[PDB]
Amino acid sequence: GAMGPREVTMKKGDILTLLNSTNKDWWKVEVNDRQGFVPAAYVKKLDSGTGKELVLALYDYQESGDNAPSYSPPPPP
């Protein structure tokens, strides 16, 4: 199953609002209607020009219920 009603999953090649990136080992990102803490290693700030806050998903991730990064980020592919 999936913890929490709102689960954020980053898809390789998907854009996710650069949510509170305060964390260094984890960059918060939203997904349409589901947000959560994710490993910055799976994402990376892009370049547009306007000045928005977006981050492409380099790798695939899965978050079950907005949870704080109390542990280290998972190993990428």
Swiss-Prot record:
All residue ranges annotated as the SH3 domain in the record:
5-63
Give the top-rank taxon of the lineage listed in the UniProt record for this protein.
Eukaryota
Where in or outside the cell it occurs: the entry states: Cytoplasm, Cytoskeleton; Cytoplasm, Cell cortex
Please give the family membership noted in the entry: Belongs to the spectrin family.
Tell me how this protein assembles.
Like erythrocyte spectrin, the spectrin-like proteins are capable of forming dimers which can further associate to tetramers. Interacts with ACP1.
Q: What does this protein do?
A: Morphologically, spectrin-like proteins appear to be related to spectrin, showing a flexible rod-like structure. They can bind actin but seem to differ in their calmodulin-binding activity. In nonerythroid tissues, spectrins, in association with some other proteins, may play an important role in membrane organization.
Instruction: From the Swiss-Prot or TrEMBL record, give the protein name.
Output: Spectrin alpha chain, non-erythrocytic 1
Name its species. Gallus gallus (Chicken)
Gene symbol here is: SPTAN1
From-to range in the entire protein, with total length: 967 to 1025 of 2477
